[PDB]
Amino acid sequence: MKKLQIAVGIIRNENNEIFITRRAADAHMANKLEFPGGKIEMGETPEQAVVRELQEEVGITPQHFSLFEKLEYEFPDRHITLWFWLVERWEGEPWGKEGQPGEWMSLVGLNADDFPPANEPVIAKLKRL
Ligand X SMILES: Nc1nc2c([nH]c(=O)n2[C@H]2C[C@H](O)[C@@H](COP(=O)(O)OP(=O)(O)OP(=O)(O)O)O2)c(=O)[nH]1
Binding part of the chain for ligand X, among 63-71, 85-93, 99-107, 114-122 by CB under 6 A, reads: 114-122
13 or 30, CB closer to ligand X?
30
Binding mask 34-53 for ligand X (x = CB under 6 A): xx-xxx--------------
CB 51 within 8 A of CB 60: no
88 or 112, CB closer to ligand X?
112
Binding part of the chain for ligand X, among 62-70, 86-94, 102-110, 116-124 by CB under 6 A, reads: 116-124
CA 22 to chain centre: 11
Among 51, 86, 118, 126, binds ligand X (CB under 6 A): 118
CB 87 within 8 A of CB 68: no
CB 23 within 8 A of CB 51: no
CA 103 to chain centre: 13
How many CB atoms neighbour CB 73 within 10 A? Answer: 15
Binding site for 8-oxo-dGTP, residues? 23, 28, 34-37, 119
